[PDB]
Design a protein around this motif. Structure first.
Motif, PDB file in Angstrom:
ATOM      1  N   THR A 133      55.923  46.371  70.620  1.00  0.00           N
ATOM      2  CA  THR A 133      56.969  45.377  70.791  1.00  0.00           C
ATOM      3  C   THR A 133      56.432  43.961  70.729  1.00  0.00           C
ATOM      4  OG1 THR A 133      57.890  47.019  72.317  1.00  0.00           O
ATOM      5  CG2 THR A 133      59.044  44.913  72.144  1.00  0.00           C
ATOM      6  N   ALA A 134      55.417  43.631  71.526  1.00  0.00           N
ATOM      7  CA  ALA A 134      54.803  42.315  71.514  1.00  0.00           C
ATOM      8  C   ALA A 134      54.354  41.869  70.131  1.00  0.00           C
ATOM      9  CB  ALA A 134      53.615  42.288  72.472  1.00  0.00           C
ATOM     10  N   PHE A 135      53.689  42.734  69.375  1.00  0.00           N
ATOM     11  CA  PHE A 135      53.210  42.405  68.043  1.00  0.00           C
ATOM     12  C   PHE A 135      54.278  42.376  66.978  1.00  0.00           C
ATOM     13  CE2 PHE A 135      49.396  42.810  70.359  1.00  0.00           C
ATOM     14  CZ  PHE A 135      48.560  41.905  69.729  1.00  0.00           C
ATOM     15  N   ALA A 153      58.357  42.610  80.033  1.00  0.00           N
ATOM     16  CA  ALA A 153      57.694  41.324  80.088  1.00  0.00           C
ATOM     17  C   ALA A 153      56.951  41.155  78.752  1.00  0.00           C
ATOM     18  CB  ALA A 153      56.742  41.224  81.255  1.00  0.00           C
ATOM     19  N   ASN A 154      57.488  40.275  77.931  1.00  0.00           N
ATOM     20  CA  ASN A 154      56.986  40.043  76.583  1.00  0.00           C
ATOM     21  C   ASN A 154      57.013  38.546  76.306  1.00  0.00           C
ATOM     22  OD1 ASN A 154      56.867  42.606  74.399  1.00  0.00           O
ATOM     23  ND2 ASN A 154      56.723  40.569  73.473  1.00  0.00           N
ATOM     24  N   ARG A 155      55.845  37.904  76.291  1.00  0.00           N
ATOM     25  CA  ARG A 155      55.819  36.460  76.114  1.00  0.00           C
ATOM     26  C   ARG A 155      54.623  35.920  75.351  1.00  0.00           C
ATOM     27  NH1 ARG A 155      58.327  32.712  80.830  1.00  0.00           N
ATOM     28  NH2 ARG A 155      60.067  34.112  80.298  1.00  0.00           N
ATOM     29  N   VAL A 185      48.468  32.440  73.405  1.00  0.00           N
ATOM     30  CA  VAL A 185      48.165  33.648  74.161  1.00  0.00           C
ATOM     31  C   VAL A 185      49.416  34.543  74.190  1.00  0.00           C
ATOM     32  CG1 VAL A 185      47.588  34.746  76.369  1.00  0.00           C
ATOM     33  CG2 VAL A 185      46.346  32.727  75.696  1.00  0.00           C
ATOM     34  N   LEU A 186      49.244  35.801  73.821  1.00  0.00           N
ATOM     35  CA  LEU A 186      50.322  36.784  73.873  1.00  0.00           C
ATOM     36  C   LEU A 186      50.119  37.676  75.092  1.00  0.00           C
ATOM     37  CD1 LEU A 186      52.785  38.151  72.233  1.00  0.00           C
ATOM     38  CD2 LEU A 186      51.025  39.785  71.516  1.00  0.00           C
ATOM     39  N   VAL A 187      51.111  37.778  75.965  1.00  0.00           N
ATOM     40  CA  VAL A 187      51.048  38.583  77.177  1.00  0.00           C
ATOM     41  C   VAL A 187      52.208  39.585  77.182  1.00  0.00           C
ATOM     42  CG1 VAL A 187      51.170  38.668  79.704  1.00  0.00           C
ATOM     43  CG2 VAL A 187      49.998  36.765  78.628  1.00  0.00           C
ATOM     44  N   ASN A 188      51.930  40.850  77.481  1.00  0.00           N
ATOM     45  CA  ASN A 188      52.993  41.855  77.495  1.00  0.00           C
ATOM     46  C   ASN A 188      52.726  42.999  78.450  1.00  0.00           C
ATOM     47  OD1 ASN A 188      51.615  44.194  75.872  1.00  0.00           O
ATOM     48  ND2 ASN A 188      51.199  42.325  74.703  1.00  0.00           N
TER      49      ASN A 188
END
Ligand SMILES: *[C@@H]1O[C@H](CO)[C@@H](O[C@@H]2O[C@H](CO)[C@@H](O[C@@H]3O[C@H](CO)[C@@H](O)[C@H](O)[C@@H]3O)[C@H](O)[C@H]2NC(C)=O)[C@H](O)[C@H]1NC(C)=O
Ligand SMILES: *[C@@H]1O[C@H](CO)[C@@H](O[C@@H]2O[C@H](CO)[C@@H](O)[C@H](O)[C@H]2NC(C)=O)[C@H](O)[C@H]1NC(C)=O
Ligand SMILES: *[C@@H]1O[C@H](CO)[C@@H](O[C@@H]2O[C@H](CO)[C@@H](O)[C@H](O)[C@H]2NC(C)=O)[C@H](O)[C@H]1NC(C)=O
Length: 403
Positions: A57-59, A115-117, A186-189
């Motif tokens: 999902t994040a990518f 949580a996807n940011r 920065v990608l945080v998930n």
């Protein structure tokens, strides 16, 4: 236009760049490929716990602003290219449909929080289409943070935010000093899951019992015990497959326990999506004795290293990255500095992340004297899946549950 209403033309064409879904298949190909690589690099006495769905999902979200080789690499590595009919603009549409059903607000007994940011320094501007589709489809904010002059304040803010979304179970997604003045993107998930078992165990029938580690030794685990009707099948080479559903029946827990003789590393290497799907097709409701330990796994990840090694290079490179959805005055080197993921699972007698004392009274029962037993006193694989959508939410390995 909300996430469940969104039509195909609501997820727009890009800048210059029961039934089983195609997207769910693709995600499971990523999941077993990523898991096998990670497990092969880890010792056999370590527990593994991750959410591949979260990572996928994040990518997918991040590729909205990606292009050329960066987009090509993304599509290949997460197996989105395997989805037959080419269009890479239809993957966001598929995720809208998957995210609408995954993250509902029905009374559905289990809770699943996303949580996807993507965090960018305040000097970067995110394209309006990128912001719009990230919000609509993924429920993700492209968040400006002062990285240049308040690095640590941002890191604490990031960790605080994921903490609020995980109800204080995940407090340090970003490890200390991994963000500085040079950090750009920065990608945080994470994905957070709470649920009660459909058929709860009682704490009064729990008792200290030996667990047999991969090193040859043993330790003391809190072995839970109950008897009931569960979908089961002993499959190829003595492997025991057991499904323990959560209340609602849409989210279940599948355990893969190999015979004493066969190693869990051998089962991890044989793991494919189609081998798993054949195993589920063999499962049948059966009255059996269940023995499984209380376990708590908290595995935190820094994804770049491994994703790069699998073929995702351009996205993390200042020269090579092609990200035209992100812009900064006078900068031609906008790249992702790192992708941080952390997952948590605590399993007890009540279920997933519910700590209550439900005693159980079973009056007038007399089961078959030759009923099958399931005793998980040696390493086993854990799958947390969404049945209707055919989706691997979480996946892991319990190699040492002892205190
Ligand atoms: C942890 O995350 C939750 C999200 O579910 C945060 O809850 C949200 O908090 C905001 C306030 O920061 C609430 O907004 C309220 O809106 C009314 C409407 O005008 C206003 O009068 C209030 O003063 C306030 O602004 C919001 O209702 C609340 N819930 C949602 C669903 O958004 C929670 O605040 C987060 N924790 C921390 C410490 O921020
Ligand atoms: C978001 O991306 C679009 C391109 O897909 C940018 O649109 C360009 O805008 C300038 C003028 O506004 C035009 O010269 C180009 O022809 C536009 N491109 C297309 C294909 O329409 C838009 O500017 C981007 N957003 C930001 C913040 O720059
Ligand atoms: C990224 O890929 C796009 C293709 O989607 C390339 O754009 C082509 O650019 C050339 C000249 O600039 C045009 O003749 C083509 O019409 C463009 N698009 C298509 C649809 O072919 C772009 O050159 C690639 N490279 C970079 C760095 O952006």
């Amino acid at each position: 236009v909300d996430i469940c209403t969104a039509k195909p033309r609501d997820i727009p064409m890009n800048p210059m760049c029961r039934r089983v879904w195609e997207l769910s298949k693709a995600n499971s190909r990523f999941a077993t490929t990523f898991y096998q690589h990670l497990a092969d690099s880890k010792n056999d006495n370590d527990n593994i716990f991750l959410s591949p769905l979260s990572i996928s999902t994040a990518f997918a979200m991040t590729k909205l602003g990606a292009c050329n080789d960066t987009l090509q690499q993304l599509m290949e590595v997460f197996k989105f290219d395997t989805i037959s009919e080419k269009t890479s603009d239809q993957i966001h549409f598929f995720f809208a449909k998957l995210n609408c059903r995954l993250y509902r607000k029905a009374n559905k007994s289990s809770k699943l929080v996303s949580a996807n940011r993507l965090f960018g320094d305040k000097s970067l501007t995110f394209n309006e289409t990128y912001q719009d589709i990230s919000e609509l489809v993924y429920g993700a904010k492209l968040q400006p943070l002062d990285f240049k002059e308040n690095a640590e304040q941002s890191r604490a803010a990031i960790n605080k935010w994921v903490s609020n979304k995980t109800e204080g179970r995940i407090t340090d997604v970003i490890p200390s000093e991994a963000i500085n003045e040079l950090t750009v993107l920065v990608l945080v998930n994470t994905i957070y899951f709470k649920g009660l078992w459909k058929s709860k165990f009682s704490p009064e029938n729990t008792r200290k019992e030996l667990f047999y580690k991969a090193d040859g030794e043993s330790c003391s685990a809190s072995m839970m015990y109950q008897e009931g009707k569960f979908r089961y099948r002993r499959v190829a080479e003595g492997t025991q497959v057991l499904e323990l559903p959560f209340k609602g029946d849409d989210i279940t827990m599948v355990l893969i326990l190999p015979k004493p003789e066969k190693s869990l590393a051998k089962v991890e290497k044989e793991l494919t999506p189609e081998v798993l799907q054949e195993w589920l097709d063999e499962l049948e409701e059966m009255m059996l004795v269940v023995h499984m330990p209380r376990f708590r796994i908290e595995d935190g990840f820094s994804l770049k290293e491994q994703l790069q090694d699998m073929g995702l290079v351009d996205l993390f490179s200042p020269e090579k990255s092609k990200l035209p959805g992100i812009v900064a005055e006078g900068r031609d080197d906008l790249y992702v500095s790192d992708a941080f993921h952390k997952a948590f699972l605590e399993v007890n007698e009540e279920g997933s992340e519910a700590a209550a004392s439900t005693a159980v009274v079973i009056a007038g029962r007399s089961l078959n004297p030759n009923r099958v037993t399931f005793k998980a006193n040696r390493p086993f694989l854990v799958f947390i899946r969404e049945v209707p959508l055919n989706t691997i939410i979480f996946m892991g390995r319990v190699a040492n549950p002892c205190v």
